[PDB]
Amino acid sequence: TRTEIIRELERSLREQEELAKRLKELLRELERLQREGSSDEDVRELLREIKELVEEIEKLAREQKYLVEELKRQGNEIIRELERSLREQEELAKRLKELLRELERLQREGSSDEDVRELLREIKELVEEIEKLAREQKYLVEELKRQ
């Protein structure tokens, strides 16, 4: 082992926390490109790296779910709350990929500036939420490690 599973879960939550930090940096760059005018190729190359990062974030969520179940097999309230938190993060990442699809549709199919702003706003808030859940999950895994 259970110590091996906890160790790997800590590594994974640290990694997701860093991926979310990286994603907010790419979204800031994207705001800057759309804001100050950029080529279409510039915006695409960024949206491409953004969508890849989200897929990795989702993949780590699924990895973490599997490690928590492995721990369960081997603090019942803490585990129940980590399962709910990972399911929530999974869904949030699903919602983010959908907003990124819409964002590509606006940039490609032409859209007002207001439309793009509203979507970037909802996207940055969703990343903030995913980061918040990673920090919550790190706190719960430490509570479990003690227990």
Coordinates of all heavy atoms in Angstrom, one line a residue, residues 29-85, unseen atoms left out:
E29 N -1.0 32.8 -22.8 CA -0.5 33.0 -24.1 C -1.6 33.1 -25.1 O -1.6 34.0 -26.0 CB 0.5 31.9 -24.5 CG 1.8 32.0 -23.6 CD 2.9 31.0 -24.1 OE1 2.8 30.5 -25.2 OE2 3.8 30.8 -23.3
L30 N -2.6 32.2 -25.1 CA -3.7 32.3 -26.1 C -4.4 33.6 -26.0 O -4.7 34.2 -27.1 CB -4.6 31.1 -26.0 CG -5.8 31.0 -26.9 CD1 -5.3 30.8 -28.3 CD2 -6.7 29.8 -26.5
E31 N -4.8 34.0 -24.8 CA -5.5 35.3 -24.7 C -4.6 36.4 -25.3 O -5.1 37.3 -25.9 CB -5.7 35.6 -23.2 CG -6.7 34.8 -22.5 CD -7.0 35.3 -21.1 OE1 -6.4 36.3 -20.6 OE2 -7.9 34.7 -20.4
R32 N -3.3 36.3 -25.1 CA -2.4 37.3 -25.6 C -2.4 37.3 -27.2 O -2.4 38.4 -27.8 CB -1.0 37.1 -25.1 CG 0.0 38.0 -25.9 CD 1.4 38.1 -25.2 NE 2.1 36.9 -25.3 CZ 2.8 36.5 -26.4 NH1 2.8 37.2 -27.5 NH2 3.5 35.3 -26.4
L33 N -2.4 36.1 -27.8 CA -2.4 36.1 -29.2 C -3.7 36.6 -29.8 O -3.7 37.5 -30.6 CB -2.2 34.6 -29.7
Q34 N -4.8 36.2 -29.3 CA -6.1 36.7 -29.8 C -6.3 38.2 -29.4 O -6.8 38.9 -30.2 CB -7.3 35.9 -29.2
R35 N -5.7 38.6 -28.3 CA -5.9 40.0 -27.8 C -5.1 40.9 -28.7 O -5.6 41.9 -29.2 CB -5.5 40.1 -26.4 CG -5.2 41.5 -25.9 CD -4.9 41.6 -24.4 NE -3.6 40.9 -24.1
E36 N -3.8 40.6 -28.9 CA -3.0 41.6 -29.6 C -2.8 41.2 -31.1 O -1.9 41.7 -31.8 CB -1.6 41.6 -29.0 CG -0.6 40.6 -29.4 CD 0.7 40.6 -28.5 OE1 0.6 41.1 -27.4 OE2 1.7 40.1 -29.0
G37 N -3.6 40.3 -31.6 CA -3.5 39.9 -33.0 C -2.4 39.0 -33.3 O -1.2 39.2 -32.9
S38 N -2.7 37.8 -33.8 CA -1.7 36.8 -34.2 C -2.2 36.1 -35.5 O -3.4 36.2 -35.8 CB -1.5 35.8 -33.0
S39 N -1.3 35.4 -36.1 CA -1.6 34.6 -37.2 C -2.5 33.4 -36.8 O -2.5 33.0 -35.6 CB -0.3 34.0 -37.9 OG 0.2 33.0 -37.0
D40 N -3.2 32.9 -37.7 CA -4.0 31.7 -37.5 C -3.1 30.5 -37.2 O -3.5 29.7 -36.4 CB -4.8 31.4 -38.8 CG -5.9 32.4 -39.0 OD1 -6.2 33.2 -38.1 OD2 -6.5 32.4 -40.1
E41 N -2.0 30.4 -37.8 CA -1.1 29.3 -37.5 C -0.6 29.4 -36.0 O -0.5 28.4 -35.3 CB 0.2 29.3 -38.4 CG 1.1 28.1 -38.0 CD 2.2 27.9 -39.0 OE1 2.5 28.8 -39.8 OE2 2.9 26.8 -38.9
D42 N -0.3 30.6 -35.5 CA 0.0 30.8 -34.1 C -1.1 30.3 -33.2 O -0.8 29.5 -32.3 CB 0.3 32.3 -33.8 CG 1.7 32.8 -34.4 OD1 2.4 31.9 -34.8 OD2 1.9 34.0 -34.4
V43 N -2.3 30.7 -33.5 CA -3.4 30.2 -32.6 C -3.6 28.7 -32.6 O -3.8 28.1 -31.6 CB -4.7 31.0 -32.9 CG1 -5.8 30.5 -32.2 CG2 -4.6 32.5 -32.7
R44 N -3.5 28.1 -33.8 CA -3.6 26.7 -33.9 C -2.5 25.9 -33.2 O -2.8 25.0 -32.5 CB -3.6 26.3 -35.4
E45 N -1.3 26.3 -33.3 CA -0.2 25.6 -32.7 C -0.4 25.6 -31.2 O -0.2 24.7 -30.5 CB 1.1 26.2 -33.0 CG 1.6 25.9 -34.4 CD 1.7 24.4 -34.6 OE1 2.1 23.7 -33.7 OE2 1.5 23.9 -35.8
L46 N -1.0 26.7 -30.6 CA -1.3 26.8 -29.2 C -2.5 25.9 -28.9 O -2.5 25.2 -27.9 CB -1.6 28.2 -28.9 CG -1.5 28.7 -27.4 CD1 -0.4 27.9 -26.7 CD2 -1.3 30.2 -27.3
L47 N -3.6 26.0 -29.7 CA -4.8 25.2 -29.3 C -4.4 23.7 -29.3 O -5.0 22.9 -28.5 CB -5.9 25.5 -30.3 CG -6.7 26.8 -30.1 CD1 -7.9 26.9 -31.1 CD2 -7.3 26.8 -28.6
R48 N -3.6 23.3 -30.2 CA -3.1 21.9 -30.3 C -2.4 21.5 -29.1 O -2.6 20.4 -28.6 CB -2.1 21.8 -31.5
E49 N -1.5 22.3 -28.5 CA -0.7 21.9 -27.3 C -1.7 21.9 -26.1 O -1.6 21.1 -25.2 CB 0.4 22.9 -27.0 CG 1.5 22.9 -28.0 CD 2.8 23.4 -27.5 OE1 2.9 23.5 -26.2 OE2 3.7 23.8 -28.2
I50 N -2.6 22.9 -26.1 CA -3.7 22.9 -25.0 C -4.5 21.6 -25.0 O -4.7 21.0 -23.9 CB -4.6 24.1 -25.2 CG1 -3.8 25.4 -24.8 CG2 -5.9 24.1 -24.4 CD1 -4.4 26.6 -25.2
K51 N -5.0 21.2 -26.1 CA -5.9 20.0 -26.1 C -5.1 18.7 -25.7 O -5.6 17.8 -25.1 CB -6.5 19.8 -27.5 CG -7.5 20.8 -27.9
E52 N -3.8 18.7 -26.1 CA -2.9 17.5 -25.7 C -2.7 17.5 -24.2 O -2.7 16.5 -23.6 CB -1.6 17.6 -26.4
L53 N -2.6 18.7 -23.6 CA -2.4 18.8 -22.2 C -3.7 18.3 -21.5 O -3.6 17.7 -20.4 CB -2.1 20.2 -21.7 CG -0.8 20.7 -21.2 CD1 -0.7 22.1 -20.8 CD2 -0.6 19.8 -20.0
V54 N -4.9 18.7 -22.0 CA -6.1 18.3 -21.3 C -6.2 16.8 -21.4 O -6.6 16.1 -20.4 CB -7.3 18.9 -22.0 CG1 -8.7 18.5 -21.3 CG2 -7.2 20.4 -21.9
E55 N -5.9 16.2 -22.5 CA -5.9 14.7 -22.6 C -5.0 14.1 -21.6 O -5.3 13.0 -21.0 CB -5.6 14.2 -24.0 CG -6.8 14.1 -24.9 CD -6.6 13.3 -26.1 OE1 -5.6 12.5 -26.1 OE2 -7.4 13.4 -27.0
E56 N -3.8 14.7 -21.3 CA -3.0 14.1 -20.3 C -3.5 14.2 -18.9 O -3.4 13.3 -18.1 CB -1.6 14.7 -20.3
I57 N -4.2 15.4 -18.6 CA -4.8 15.6 -17.4 C -5.9 14.6 -17.1 O -6.0 14.0 -16.1 CB -5.4 17.0 -17.3 CG1 -4.1 17.9 -17.1 CG2 -6.4 17.1 -16.2 CD1 -4.5 19.4 -17.2
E58 N -6.7 14.3 -18.2 CA -7.8 13.3 -18.1 C -7.2 11.9 -17.8 O -7.7 11.1 -17.1 CB -8.6 13.3 -19.4 CG -10.0 12.7 -19.3 CD -10.7 12.9 -20.6 OE1 -10.1 13.7 -21.5 OE2 -11.7 12.3 -20.9
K59 N -6.1 11.6 -18.6 CA -5.4 10.3 -18.4 C -4.9 10.1 -17.0 O -5.0 9.0 -16.4 CB -4.2 10.2 -19.4 CG -4.6 9.8 -20.8
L60 N -4.3 11.1 -16.4 CA -3.8 11.0 -15.0 C -5.0 10.9 -14.0 O -4.9 10.2 -13.0 CB -3.0 12.3 -14.6 CG -1.6 12.3 -15.2 CD1 -1.0 13.7 -14.8 CD2 -0.8 11.2 -14.6
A61 N -6.1 11.5 -14.3 CA -7.3 11.3 -13.5 C -7.7 9.8 -13.5 O -8.0 9.3 -12.4 CB -8.5 12.1 -14.0
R62 N -7.7 9.2 -14.6 CA -8.1 7.8 -14.7 C -7.1 6.9 -14.1 O -7.4 5.9 -13.3 CB -8.2 7.4 -16.2 CG -9.5 8.1 -16.9 CD -9.8 7.4 -18.2 NE -8.7 7.5 -19.2 CZ -8.6 8.5 -20.1 NH1 -9.6 9.4 -20.2 NH2 -7.6 8.6 -21.0
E63 N -5.8 7.2 -14.2 CA -4.7 6.5 -13.5 C -4.9 6.6 -12.0 O -4.8 5.6 -11.2 CB -3.4 7.1 -13.8 CG -2.2 6.7 -13.1 CD -1.0 7.4 -13.6 OE1 -0.6 7.0 -14.7 OE2 -0.5 8.4 -12.9
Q64 N -5.3 7.8 -11.5 CA -5.5 8.0 -10.1 C -6.7 7.3 -9.6 O -6.7 6.7 -8.5 CB -5.6 9.5 -9.7 CG -4.3 10.2 -9.9 CD -4.4 11.7 -10.3 OE1 -5.5 12.3 -10.2 NE2 -3.3 12.3 -10.7
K65 N -7.8 7.2 -10.4 CA -8.9 6.4 -10.0 C -8.5 4.9 -9.7 O -8.9 4.3 -8.8 CB -10.0 6.5 -11.0 CG -10.7 7.8 -11.0 CD -11.8 7.8 -12.2 CE -12.9 6.9 -12.0 NZ -13.8 6.8 -13.2
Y66 N -7.7 4.4 -10.6 CA -7.3 3.0 -10.5 C -6.4 2.8 -9.3 O -6.5 1.7 -8.7 CB -6.5 2.7 -11.8 CG -5.7 1.4 -11.7 CD1 -6.3 0.2 -11.7 CD2 -4.3 1.5 -11.4 CE1 -5.6 -1.0 -11.5 CE2 -3.6 0.3 -11.3 CZ -4.3 -0.9 -11.3 OH -3.6 -2.1 -11.2
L67 N -5.6 3.7 -9.0 CA -4.7 3.6 -7.8 C -5.5 3.7 -6.5 O -5.3 2.9 -5.5 CB -3.7 4.6 -7.8 CG -2.6 4.5 -8.9 CD1 -1.9 5.8 -9.1 CD2 -1.7 3.4 -8.5
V68 N -6.5 4.6 -6.4 CA -7.4 4.6 -5.3 C -8.2 3.3 -5.1 O -8.4 2.9 -4.0 CB -8.4 5.8 -5.3 CG1 -9.5 5.8 -4.3 CG2 -7.5 7.2 -5.2
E69 N -8.7 2.7 -6.2 CA -9.4 1.5 -6.0 C -8.4 0.4 -5.5 O -8.8 -0.5 -4.7 CB -10.0 1.1 -7.3 CG -10.8 2.2 -7.9
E70 N -7.2 0.4 -6.0 CA -6.2 -0.5 -5.5 C -6.0 -0.3 -4.0 O -5.8 -1.3 -3.3 CB -4.9 -0.3 -6.4 CG -4.1 -1.5 -6.6 CD -4.8 -2.7 -7.2 OE1 -5.4 -2.6 -8.3 OE2 -4.8 -3.6 -6.5
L71 N -5.9 0.9 -3.6 CA -5.8 1.2 -2.2 C -7.0 0.7 -1.4 O -6.9 0.1 -0.3 CB -5.6 2.7 -1.9 CG -4.3 3.2 -1.7 CD1 -4.4 4.8 -1.4 CD2 -3.4 2.5 -0.7
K72 N -8.2 0.9 -1.9 CA -9.5 0.4 -1.3 C -9.4 -1.1 -1.1 O -9.8 -1.6 0.0 CB -10.6 0.8 -2.2 CG -12.0 0.5 -1.6 CD -13.1 1.2 -2.5 CE -14.5 0.7 -2.3 NZ -15.2 1.2 -3.6
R73 N -9.1 -1.8 -2.1 CA -9.0 -3.3 -2.0 C -8.0 -3.6 -0.8 O -8.4 -4.5 0.0 CB -8.5 -3.9 -3.3 CG -9.5 -3.8 -4.4
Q74 N -6.9 -3.0 -0.7 CA -5.9 -3.1 0.3 C -6.2 -2.2 1.5 O -6.4 -2.7 2.7 CB -4.5 -2.9 -0.2
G75 N -9.1 4.6 6.0 CA -10.0 5.6 6.3 C -11.1 5.6 5.2 O -10.9 6.2 4.1
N76 N -12.2 5.0 5.6 CA -13.3 4.8 4.6 C -13.9 6.1 4.1 O -14.2 6.3 2.9 CB -14.3 3.9 5.1 CG -13.7 2.5 5.4 OD1 -13.6 2.1 6.6 ND2 -13.2 1.9 4.4
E77 N -14.1 7.1 5.0 CA -14.6 8.4 4.6 C -13.6 9.1 3.6 O -14.0 9.7 2.7 CB -14.9 9.2 5.8 CG -13.5 9.5 6.6 CD -13.7 9.6 8.1 OE1 -14.8 9.9 8.6 OE2 -12.7 9.3 8.9
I78 N -12.3 8.9 3.9 CA -11.3 9.6 3.0 C -11.4 9.0 1.7 O -11.4 9.7 0.7 CB -9.9 9.5 3.6 CG1 -9.9 10.2 5.0 CG2 -8.9 10.2 2.7 CD1 -10.3 11.7 5.0
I79 N -11.4 7.6 1.6 CA -11.5 7.0 0.2 C -12.7 7.4 -0.5 O -12.7 7.7 -1.7 CB -11.3 5.5 0.4 CG1 -9.8 5.2 0.7 CG2 -11.7 4.8 -0.9 CD1 -9.6 3.8 1.1
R80 N -13.9 7.4 0.2 CA -15.1 7.7 -0.5 C -15.0 9.1 -1.1 O -15.4 9.3 -2.3 CB -16.3 7.6 0.4 CG -16.8 6.2 0.6 CD -18.3 6.2 1.3 NE -18.2 6.9 2.6 CZ -17.9 6.4 3.7 NH1 -17.5 5.1 3.8 NH2 -17.8 7.1 4.8
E81 N -14.5 10.0 -0.3 CA -14.3 11.4 -0.8 C -13.3 11.6 -2.0 O -13.5 12.3 -2.9 CB -13.9 12.4 0.3 CG -14.0 13.8 -0.1 CD -15.5 14.3 -0.4 OE1 -16.4 13.6 0.0 OE2 -15.7 15.3 -1.1
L82 N -12.2 10.8 -2.0 CA -11.3 10.8 -3.1 C -11.9 10.3 -4.4 O -11.7 10.8 -5.4 CB -10.1 10.0 -2.7 CG -8.8 10.6 -2.2 CD1 -7.9 9.4 -1.8 CD2 -8.3 11.5 -3.2
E83 N -12.7 9.2 -4.2 CA -13.4 8.7 -5.4 C -14.3 9.7 -6.0 O -14.4 10.0 -7.2 CB -14.2 7.4 -5.1 CG -13.3 6.1 -4.8 CD -14.1 4.9 -4.4 OE1 -14.8 4.9 -3.3 OE2 -14.1 3.9 -5.0
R84 N -15.1 10.4 -5.2 CA -16.0 11.4 -5.7 C -15.2 12.5 -6.3 O -15.6 13.1 -7.4 CB -16.9 12.0 -4.5 CG -18.0 11.0 -4.1 CD -19.0 11.8 -3.2 NE -18.4 12.0 -1.9 CZ -18.5 11.2 -0.9 NH1 -19.2 10.1 -1.0 NH2 -18.0 11.5 0.3
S85 N -14.1 12.9 -5.7 CA -13.3 14.0 -6.2 C -12.7 13.7 -7.6 O -12.7 14.5 -8.5 CB -12.2 14.4 -5.2 OG -11.6 15.6 -5.5

